[PDB]
């Protein structure tokens, strides 16, 4: 539900998935992230490799890396 708030906050087109563009705009708030670094983290969370981060892949990544959250 707190993971649900951050996900919906950055899913700006309301399609239920996080694209590279929306993840880049999301990472622009935390600080400065190079284009090669956002590509790496997109490929780490995108388990099925379809080009998007759905909500199940996001919550699966969070409670598997509690040190990151």
């Amino acid at each position, epitope marked *: 539900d707190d993971m649900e708030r951050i996900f919906k906050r950055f899913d700006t087109n309301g399609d239920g998935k996080i694209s*590279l563009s929306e993840l880049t705009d999301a990472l622009r708030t935390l600080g400065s992230t190079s284009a090669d670094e956002v*590509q*790496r983290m997109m*490929a*780490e969370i995108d*388990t099925d*490799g*379809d*080009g*998007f981060i759905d909500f199940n892949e996001f919550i699966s990544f969070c409670n598997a890396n509690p040190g990151l959250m």
Partner: antibody
Amino acid sequence: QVQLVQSGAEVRNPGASVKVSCKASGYTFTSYAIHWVRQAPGHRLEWVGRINTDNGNTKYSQKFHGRVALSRDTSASTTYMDLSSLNSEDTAVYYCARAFYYSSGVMFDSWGQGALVTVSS
Amino acid sequence: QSALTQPPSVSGAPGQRVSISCTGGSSNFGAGYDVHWYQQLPATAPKLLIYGNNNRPSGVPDRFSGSKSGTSASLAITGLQAEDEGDYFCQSFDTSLSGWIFGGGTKLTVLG
């Protein structure tokens, strides 16, 4: 300047196995996933699997029934494809491709020259 | 349908225009996945021609243009040249199969 160089051609017998390599250069190897695609003679492109170069977790197509395995070597920037229990239906060219995210998805932007595998008598 | 359907072959005189269709289904095009096009010239590996319905990488002229509906996609090639002869594949992601799918490919012949 992104380039994927694959190993040469291989000939195997029905039941043997084969390993094909795919060396990457010209970019950060551990920041992009590598996909494997095969093309049988007179057939369409067939997706084999995906491997995260960093983790390195894999994702295989169920059309192989656990017969294919992907592996990676970050120190050499090379991904390997092993296909056991070979049969004549596996006779194909095997390409490796890099997944590159764009604004609204991901694409296979760079391909390797391909490696011919022939499972003959 | 969880597969991409293409016409087997297209042909046209040098300088003319051809179109290559690619129909999908609710689990691929209808699921919000863009279509990519790849060009496989004779005796080479596939090359990225169109990504994201109608974006061209550096090196592809505007003679190649793509379109996409929620269920169909098309690849337009204007001003045919002899160097365009080869095979063309569309590509998308199917969510029911949870994998990448390619069309059967279309052999484009430039009439000589």
